PDB file of C-alpha atoms (C1' of nucleotides) and ligand atoms in Angstrom:
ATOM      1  CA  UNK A   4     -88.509  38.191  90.391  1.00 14.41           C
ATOM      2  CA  UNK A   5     -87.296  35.072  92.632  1.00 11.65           C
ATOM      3  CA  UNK A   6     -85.066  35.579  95.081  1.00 10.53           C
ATOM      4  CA  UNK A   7     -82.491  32.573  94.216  1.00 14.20           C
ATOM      5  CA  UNK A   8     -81.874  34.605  91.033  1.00 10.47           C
ATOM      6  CA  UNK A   9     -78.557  36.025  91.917  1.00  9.53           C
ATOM      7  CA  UNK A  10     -78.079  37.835  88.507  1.00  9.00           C
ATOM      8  CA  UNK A  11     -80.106  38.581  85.454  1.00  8.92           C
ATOM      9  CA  UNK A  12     -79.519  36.349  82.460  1.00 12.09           C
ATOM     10  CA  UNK A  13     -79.818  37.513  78.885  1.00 10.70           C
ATOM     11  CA  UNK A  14     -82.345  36.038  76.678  1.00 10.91           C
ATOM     12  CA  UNK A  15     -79.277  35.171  74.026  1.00 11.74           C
ATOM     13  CA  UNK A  16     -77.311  33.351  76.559  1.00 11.24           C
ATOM     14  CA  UNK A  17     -79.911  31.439  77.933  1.00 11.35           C
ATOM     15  CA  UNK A  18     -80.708  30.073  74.316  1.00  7.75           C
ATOM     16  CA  UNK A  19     -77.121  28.739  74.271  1.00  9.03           C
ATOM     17  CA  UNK A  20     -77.501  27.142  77.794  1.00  7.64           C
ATOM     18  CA  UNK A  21     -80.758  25.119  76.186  1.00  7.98           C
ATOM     19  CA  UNK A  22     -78.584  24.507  73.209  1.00  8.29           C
ATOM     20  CA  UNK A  23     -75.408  22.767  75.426  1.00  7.18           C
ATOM     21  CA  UNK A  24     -77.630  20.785  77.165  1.00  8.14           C
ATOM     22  CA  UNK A  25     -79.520  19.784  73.429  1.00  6.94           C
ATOM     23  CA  UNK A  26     -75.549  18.828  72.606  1.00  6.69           C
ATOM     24  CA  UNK A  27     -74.845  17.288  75.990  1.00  8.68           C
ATOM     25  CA  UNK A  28     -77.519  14.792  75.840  1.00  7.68           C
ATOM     26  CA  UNK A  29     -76.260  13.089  72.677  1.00  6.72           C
ATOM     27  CA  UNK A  30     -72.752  14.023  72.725  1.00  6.88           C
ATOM     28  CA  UNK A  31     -72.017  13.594  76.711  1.00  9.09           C
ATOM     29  CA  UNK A  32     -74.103  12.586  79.663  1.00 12.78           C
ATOM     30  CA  UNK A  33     -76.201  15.084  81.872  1.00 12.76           C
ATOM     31  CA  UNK A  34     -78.482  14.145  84.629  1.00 11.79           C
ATOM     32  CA  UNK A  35     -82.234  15.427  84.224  1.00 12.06           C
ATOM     33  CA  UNK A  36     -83.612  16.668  87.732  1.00 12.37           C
ATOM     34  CA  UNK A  37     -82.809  18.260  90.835  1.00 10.16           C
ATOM     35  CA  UNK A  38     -82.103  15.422  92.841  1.00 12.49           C
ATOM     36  CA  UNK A  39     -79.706  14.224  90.112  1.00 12.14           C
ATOM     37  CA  UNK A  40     -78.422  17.559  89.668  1.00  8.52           C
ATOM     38  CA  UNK A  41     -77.756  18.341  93.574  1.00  8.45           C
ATOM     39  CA  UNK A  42     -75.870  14.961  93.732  1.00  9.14           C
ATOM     40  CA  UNK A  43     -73.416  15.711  90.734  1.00 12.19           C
ATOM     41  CA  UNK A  44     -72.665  19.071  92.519  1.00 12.25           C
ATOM     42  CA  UNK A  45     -72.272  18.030  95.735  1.00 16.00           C
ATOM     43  CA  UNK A  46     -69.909  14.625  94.011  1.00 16.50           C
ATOM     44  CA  UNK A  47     -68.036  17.529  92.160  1.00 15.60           C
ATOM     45  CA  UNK A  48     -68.590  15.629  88.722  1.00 13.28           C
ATOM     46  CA  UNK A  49     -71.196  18.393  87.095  1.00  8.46           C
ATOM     47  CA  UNK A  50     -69.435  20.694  84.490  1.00 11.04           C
ATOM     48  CA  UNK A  51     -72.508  23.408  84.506  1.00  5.55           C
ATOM     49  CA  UNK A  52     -75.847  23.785  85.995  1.00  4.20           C
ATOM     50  CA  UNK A  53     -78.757  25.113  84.859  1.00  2.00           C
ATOM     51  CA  UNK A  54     -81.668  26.334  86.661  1.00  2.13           C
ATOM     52  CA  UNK A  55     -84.925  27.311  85.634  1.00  2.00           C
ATOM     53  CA  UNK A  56     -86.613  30.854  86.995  1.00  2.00           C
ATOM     54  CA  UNK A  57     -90.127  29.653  87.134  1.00  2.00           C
ATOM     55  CA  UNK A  58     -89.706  27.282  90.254  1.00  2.00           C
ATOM     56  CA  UNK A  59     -92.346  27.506  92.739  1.00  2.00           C
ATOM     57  CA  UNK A  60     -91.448  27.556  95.565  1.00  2.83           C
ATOM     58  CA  UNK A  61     -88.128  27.928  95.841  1.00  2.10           C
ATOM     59  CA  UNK A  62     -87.223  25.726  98.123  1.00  2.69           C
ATOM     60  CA  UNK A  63     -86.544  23.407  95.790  1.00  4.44           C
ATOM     61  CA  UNK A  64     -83.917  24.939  93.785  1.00  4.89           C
ATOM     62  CA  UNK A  65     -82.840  27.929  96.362  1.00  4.41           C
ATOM     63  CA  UNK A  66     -79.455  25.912  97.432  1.00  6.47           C
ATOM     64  CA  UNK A  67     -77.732  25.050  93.924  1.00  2.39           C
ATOM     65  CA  UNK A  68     -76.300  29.110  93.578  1.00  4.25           C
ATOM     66  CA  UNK A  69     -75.294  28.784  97.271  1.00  5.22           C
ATOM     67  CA  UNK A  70     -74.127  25.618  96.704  1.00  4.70           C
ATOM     68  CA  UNK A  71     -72.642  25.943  93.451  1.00  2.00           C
ATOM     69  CA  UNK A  72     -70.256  28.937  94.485  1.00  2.00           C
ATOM     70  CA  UNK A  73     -68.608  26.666  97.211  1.00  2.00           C
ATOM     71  CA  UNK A  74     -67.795  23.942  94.647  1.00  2.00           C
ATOM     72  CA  UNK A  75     -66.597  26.278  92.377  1.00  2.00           C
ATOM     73  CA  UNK A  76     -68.967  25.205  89.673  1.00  2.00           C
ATOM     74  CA  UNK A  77     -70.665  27.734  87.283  1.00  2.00           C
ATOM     75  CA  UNK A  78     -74.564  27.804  87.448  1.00  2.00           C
ATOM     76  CA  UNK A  79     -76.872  30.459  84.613  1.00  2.00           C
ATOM     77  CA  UNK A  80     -80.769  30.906  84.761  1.00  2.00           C
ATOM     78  CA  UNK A  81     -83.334  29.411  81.918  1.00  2.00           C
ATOM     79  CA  UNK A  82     -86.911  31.472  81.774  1.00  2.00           C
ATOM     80  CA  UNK A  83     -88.695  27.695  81.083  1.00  2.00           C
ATOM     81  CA  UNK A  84     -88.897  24.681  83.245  1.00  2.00           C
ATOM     82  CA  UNK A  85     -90.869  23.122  80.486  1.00  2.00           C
ATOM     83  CA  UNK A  86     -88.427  23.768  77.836  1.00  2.00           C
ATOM     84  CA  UNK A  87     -85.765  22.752  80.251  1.00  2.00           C
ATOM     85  CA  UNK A  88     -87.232  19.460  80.371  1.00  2.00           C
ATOM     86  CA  UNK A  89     -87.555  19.330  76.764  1.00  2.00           C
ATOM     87  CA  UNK A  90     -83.543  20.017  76.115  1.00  2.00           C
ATOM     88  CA  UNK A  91     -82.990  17.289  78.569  1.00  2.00           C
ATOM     89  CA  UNK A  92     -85.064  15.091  76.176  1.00  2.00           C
ATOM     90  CA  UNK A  93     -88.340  13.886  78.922  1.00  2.00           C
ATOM     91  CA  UNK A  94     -91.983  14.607  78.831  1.00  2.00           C
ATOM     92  CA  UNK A  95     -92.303  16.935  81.996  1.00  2.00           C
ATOM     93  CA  UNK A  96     -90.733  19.405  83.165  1.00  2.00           C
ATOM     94  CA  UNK A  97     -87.272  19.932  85.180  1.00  2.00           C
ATOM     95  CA  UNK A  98     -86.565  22.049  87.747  1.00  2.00           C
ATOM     96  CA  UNK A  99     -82.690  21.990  87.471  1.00  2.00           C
ATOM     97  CA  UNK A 100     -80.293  20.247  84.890  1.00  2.00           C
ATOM     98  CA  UNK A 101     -76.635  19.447  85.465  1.00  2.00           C
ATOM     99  CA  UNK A 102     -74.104  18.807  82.596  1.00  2.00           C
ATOM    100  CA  UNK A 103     -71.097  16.265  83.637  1.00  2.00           C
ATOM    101  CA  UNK A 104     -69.939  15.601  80.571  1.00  2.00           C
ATOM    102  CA  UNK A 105     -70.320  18.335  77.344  1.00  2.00           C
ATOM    103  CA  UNK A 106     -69.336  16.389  75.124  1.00  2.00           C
ATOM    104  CA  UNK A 107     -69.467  17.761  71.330  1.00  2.00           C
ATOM    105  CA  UNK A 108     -70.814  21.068  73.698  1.00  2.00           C
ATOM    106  CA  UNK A 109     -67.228  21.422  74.999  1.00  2.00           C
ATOM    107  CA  UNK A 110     -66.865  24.728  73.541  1.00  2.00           C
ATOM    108  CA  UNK A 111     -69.912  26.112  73.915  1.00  2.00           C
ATOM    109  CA  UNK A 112     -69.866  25.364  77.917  1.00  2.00           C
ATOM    110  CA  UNK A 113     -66.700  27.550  77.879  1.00  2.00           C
ATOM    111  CA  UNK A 114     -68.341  30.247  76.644  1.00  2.00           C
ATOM    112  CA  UNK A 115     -70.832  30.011  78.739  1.00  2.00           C
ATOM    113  CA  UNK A 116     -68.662  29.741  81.803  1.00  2.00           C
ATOM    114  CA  UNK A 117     -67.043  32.809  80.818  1.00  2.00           C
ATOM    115  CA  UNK A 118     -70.424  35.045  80.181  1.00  2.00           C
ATOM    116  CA  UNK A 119     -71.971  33.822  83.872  1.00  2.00           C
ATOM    117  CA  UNK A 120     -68.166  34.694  85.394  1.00  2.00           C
ATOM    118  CA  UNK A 121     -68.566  38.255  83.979  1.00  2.00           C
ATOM    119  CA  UNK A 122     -72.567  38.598  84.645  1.00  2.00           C
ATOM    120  CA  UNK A 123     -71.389  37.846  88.483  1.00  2.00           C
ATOM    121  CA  UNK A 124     -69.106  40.470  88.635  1.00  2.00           C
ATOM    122  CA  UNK A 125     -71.554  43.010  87.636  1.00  2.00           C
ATOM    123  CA  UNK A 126     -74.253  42.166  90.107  1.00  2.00           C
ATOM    124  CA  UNK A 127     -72.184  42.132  92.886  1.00  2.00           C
ATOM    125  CA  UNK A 128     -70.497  45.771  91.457  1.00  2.00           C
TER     126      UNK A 128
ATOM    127  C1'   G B   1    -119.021 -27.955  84.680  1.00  2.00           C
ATOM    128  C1'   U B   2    -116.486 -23.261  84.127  1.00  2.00           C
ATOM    129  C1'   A B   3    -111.640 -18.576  81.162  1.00  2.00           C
ATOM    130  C1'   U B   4    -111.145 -14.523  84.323  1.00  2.00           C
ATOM    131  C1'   G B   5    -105.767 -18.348  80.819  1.00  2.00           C
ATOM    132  C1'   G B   6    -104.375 -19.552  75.940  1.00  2.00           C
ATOM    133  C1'   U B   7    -104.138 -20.640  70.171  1.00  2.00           C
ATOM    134  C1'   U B   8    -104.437 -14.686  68.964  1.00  2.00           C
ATOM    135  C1'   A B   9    -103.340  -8.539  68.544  1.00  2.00           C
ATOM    136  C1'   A B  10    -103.979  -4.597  67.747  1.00  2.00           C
ATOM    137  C1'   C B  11    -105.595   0.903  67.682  1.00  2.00           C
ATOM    138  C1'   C B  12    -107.444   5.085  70.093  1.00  2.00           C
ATOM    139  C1'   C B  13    -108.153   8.841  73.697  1.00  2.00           C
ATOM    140  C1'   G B  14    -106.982  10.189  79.018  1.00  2.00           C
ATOM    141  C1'   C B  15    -104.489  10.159  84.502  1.00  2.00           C
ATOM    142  C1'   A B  16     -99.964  10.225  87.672  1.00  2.00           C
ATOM    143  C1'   G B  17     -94.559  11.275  86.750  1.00  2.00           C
ATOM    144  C1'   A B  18     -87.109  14.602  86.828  1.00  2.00           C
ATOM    145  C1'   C B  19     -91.383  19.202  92.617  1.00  2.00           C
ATOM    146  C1'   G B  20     -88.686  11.716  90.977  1.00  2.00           C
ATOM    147  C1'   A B  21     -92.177   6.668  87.279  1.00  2.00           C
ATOM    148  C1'   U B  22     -90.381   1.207  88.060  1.00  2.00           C
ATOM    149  C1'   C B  23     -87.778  -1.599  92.014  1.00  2.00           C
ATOM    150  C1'   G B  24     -86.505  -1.447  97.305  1.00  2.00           C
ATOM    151  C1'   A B  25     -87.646  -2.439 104.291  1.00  2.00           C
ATOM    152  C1'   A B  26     -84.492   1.624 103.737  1.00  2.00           C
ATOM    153  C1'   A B  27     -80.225   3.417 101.654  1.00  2.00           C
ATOM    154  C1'   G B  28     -80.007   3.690  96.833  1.00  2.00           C
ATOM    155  C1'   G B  29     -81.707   4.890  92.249  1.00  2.00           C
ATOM    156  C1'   G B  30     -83.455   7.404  87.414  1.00  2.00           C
ATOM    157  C1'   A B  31     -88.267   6.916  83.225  1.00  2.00           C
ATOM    158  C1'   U B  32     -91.883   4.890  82.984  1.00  2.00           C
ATOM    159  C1'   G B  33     -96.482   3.270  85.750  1.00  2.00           C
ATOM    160  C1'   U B  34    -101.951   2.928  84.910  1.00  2.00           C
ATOM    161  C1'   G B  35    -107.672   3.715  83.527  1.00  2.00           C
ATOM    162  C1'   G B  36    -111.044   3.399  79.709  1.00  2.00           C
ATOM    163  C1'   A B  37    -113.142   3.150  74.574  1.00  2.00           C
ATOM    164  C1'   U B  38    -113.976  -0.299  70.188  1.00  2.54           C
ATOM    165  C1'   G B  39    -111.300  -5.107  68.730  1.00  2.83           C
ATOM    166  C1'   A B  40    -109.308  -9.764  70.688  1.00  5.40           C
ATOM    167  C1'   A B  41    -114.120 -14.088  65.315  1.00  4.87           C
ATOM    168  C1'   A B  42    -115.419 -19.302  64.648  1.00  6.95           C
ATOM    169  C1'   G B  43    -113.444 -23.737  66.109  1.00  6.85           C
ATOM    170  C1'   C B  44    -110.083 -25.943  69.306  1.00  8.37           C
ATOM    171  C1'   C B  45    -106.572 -26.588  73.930  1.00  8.48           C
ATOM    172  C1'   U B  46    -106.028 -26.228  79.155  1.00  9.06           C
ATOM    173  C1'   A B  47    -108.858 -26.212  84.466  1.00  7.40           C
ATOM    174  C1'   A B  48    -105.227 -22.792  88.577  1.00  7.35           C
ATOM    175  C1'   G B  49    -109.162 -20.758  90.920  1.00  7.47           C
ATOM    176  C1'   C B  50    -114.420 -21.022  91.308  1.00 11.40           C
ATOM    177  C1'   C B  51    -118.999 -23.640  91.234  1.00 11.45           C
TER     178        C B  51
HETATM  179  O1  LIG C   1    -118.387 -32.989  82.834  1.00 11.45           O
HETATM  180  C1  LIG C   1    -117.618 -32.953  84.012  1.00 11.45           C
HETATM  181  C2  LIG C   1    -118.403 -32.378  85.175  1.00 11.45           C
HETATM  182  O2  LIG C   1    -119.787 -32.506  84.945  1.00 11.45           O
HETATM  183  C3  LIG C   1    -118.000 -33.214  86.383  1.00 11.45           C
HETATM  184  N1  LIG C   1    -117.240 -32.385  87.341  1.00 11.45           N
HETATM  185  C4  LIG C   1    -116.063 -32.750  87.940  1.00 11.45           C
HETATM  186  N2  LIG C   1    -115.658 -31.754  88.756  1.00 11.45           N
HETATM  187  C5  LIG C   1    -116.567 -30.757  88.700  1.00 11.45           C
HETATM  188  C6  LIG C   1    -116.632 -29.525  89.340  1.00 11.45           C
HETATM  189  O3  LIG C   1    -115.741 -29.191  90.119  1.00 11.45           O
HETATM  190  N3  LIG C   1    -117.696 -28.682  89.094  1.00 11.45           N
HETATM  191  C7  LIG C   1    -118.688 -29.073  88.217  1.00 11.45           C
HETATM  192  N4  LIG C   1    -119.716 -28.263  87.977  1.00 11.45           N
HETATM  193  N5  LIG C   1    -118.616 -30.300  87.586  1.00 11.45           N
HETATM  194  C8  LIG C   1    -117.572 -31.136  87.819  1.00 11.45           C
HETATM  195  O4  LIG C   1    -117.167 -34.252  85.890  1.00 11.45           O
HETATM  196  C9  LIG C   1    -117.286 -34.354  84.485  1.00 11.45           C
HETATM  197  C10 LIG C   1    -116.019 -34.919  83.848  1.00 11.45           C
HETATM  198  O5  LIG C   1    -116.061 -36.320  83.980  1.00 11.45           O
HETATM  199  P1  LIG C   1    -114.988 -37.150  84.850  1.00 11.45           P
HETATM  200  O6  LIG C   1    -115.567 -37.459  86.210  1.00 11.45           O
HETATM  201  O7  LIG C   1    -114.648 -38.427  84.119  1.00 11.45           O
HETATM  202  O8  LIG C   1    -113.658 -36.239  84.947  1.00 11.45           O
HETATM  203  P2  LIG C   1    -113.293 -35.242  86.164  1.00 11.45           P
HETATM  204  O9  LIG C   1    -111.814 -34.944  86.112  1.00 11.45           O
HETATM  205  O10 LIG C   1    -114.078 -33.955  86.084  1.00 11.45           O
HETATM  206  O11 LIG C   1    -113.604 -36.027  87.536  1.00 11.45           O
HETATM  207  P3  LIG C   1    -112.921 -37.444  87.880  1.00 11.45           P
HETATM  208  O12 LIG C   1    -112.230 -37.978  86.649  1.00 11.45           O
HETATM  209  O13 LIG C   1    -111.924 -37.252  88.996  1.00 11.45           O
HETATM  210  O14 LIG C   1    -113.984 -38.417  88.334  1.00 11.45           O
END
RNA sequence: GUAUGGUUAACCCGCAGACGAUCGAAAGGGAUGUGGAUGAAAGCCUAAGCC
């Protein structure tokens, strides 16, 4: 298990993060990579981020969940890179995916923000 | 004199790429860049370069 991963996601939550950034791409506009990603946290303009588990090494990735708690913005854990990159609709793979704008996905990034708010509070008792 | 340029183009497999393609000195920026296989007839036009 990688140490970045703060807290363990569900396999039925992380389908739903896929699925809002599926929505998202048509509906909204999301930026596709980490260095996109880091710069829509750091700008304060990213609605939810999404991180994959299988990044080697971690160096890449290991600063969005610091990162992310400072900015206030809600962050939750995808098994697949690969499929990552597939929800964000490009050929390879993505490390890290950040939704500015949900779009049509409005609802379902609520939901989301609400599961990863009460995931956090049971890891950290 | 000469096509490696045209009239005249497709269709296959591969390689690198959101761990950042193209562009840029960098900053920036964000999805293409490319190697090969068979085709690209005949005739005709042009002659940069080369001879
Ligand atoms: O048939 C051509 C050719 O034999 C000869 N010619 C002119 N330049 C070259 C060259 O660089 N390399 C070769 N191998 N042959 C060349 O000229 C013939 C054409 O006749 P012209 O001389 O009338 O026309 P051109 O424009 O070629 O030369 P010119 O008109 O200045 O004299």
């Amino acid at each position: 298990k990688p140490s970045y991963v703060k807290f363990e996601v569900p396999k039925e939550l992380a389908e739903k993060a896929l699925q809002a950034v599926e929505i998202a791409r048509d509906t909204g506009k999301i930026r596709k990579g980490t260095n996109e990603t880091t710069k829509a946290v750091e700008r304060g303009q990213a609605k939810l981020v999404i991180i994959a588990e299988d990044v080697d090494p971690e160096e890449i990735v290991a600063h969005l969940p610091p990162l992310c708690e400072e900015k206030e913005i809600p962050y939750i854990y995808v098994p697949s890179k690969k499929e990552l990159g597939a929800a964000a609709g490009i050929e390879v793979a993505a490390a890290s995916v950040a939704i500015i704008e949900p779009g049509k996905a409005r609802d379902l990034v609520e939901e989301i923000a609400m599961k990863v708010r009460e995931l956090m509070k049971l890891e950290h008792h």
